[PDB]
Write a protein that binds this DNA or RNA. Structure first.
Length: 82
DNA sequence: GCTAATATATG
DNA sequence: GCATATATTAGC
């Protein structure tokens, strides 16, 4: 898992114009508060619980998807929420 | 480790 | 005003 994962998520949130809640759900099937804590702590991927490392690689796996597919998934989750 | 709930912040 | 959003933490 890249040490850059944390800025790649923040850049992706800025770029997509998306909530922590929507990204957290589609990217790694977790809640808004967990992503908020994950982004604040920026814990060294090598120094991370397997639980947390699975989340980061779930996020990295999601972020390596085509921008077009990510943006479509974000829209489904919005209309599925709204 | 994480969730849902709650206290603040934004436009 | 307000909903929507995030930072925070009590509780499972």
């Amino acid at each position: 898992v890249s040490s850059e994962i944390y800025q790649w998520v923040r850049d992706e949130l800025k770029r997509a114009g998306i909530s922590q809640a929507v990204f957290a759900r589609v990217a790694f099937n977790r809640t808004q508060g967990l992503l908020s804590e994950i982004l604040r702590k920026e814990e060294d991927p090598k120094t991370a619980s397997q639980s947390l490392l699975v989340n980061l690689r779930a996020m990295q796996n999601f972020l390596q998807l085509p921008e077009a597919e990510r943006d479509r998934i974000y829209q489904d989750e919005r209309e599925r929420s709204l």
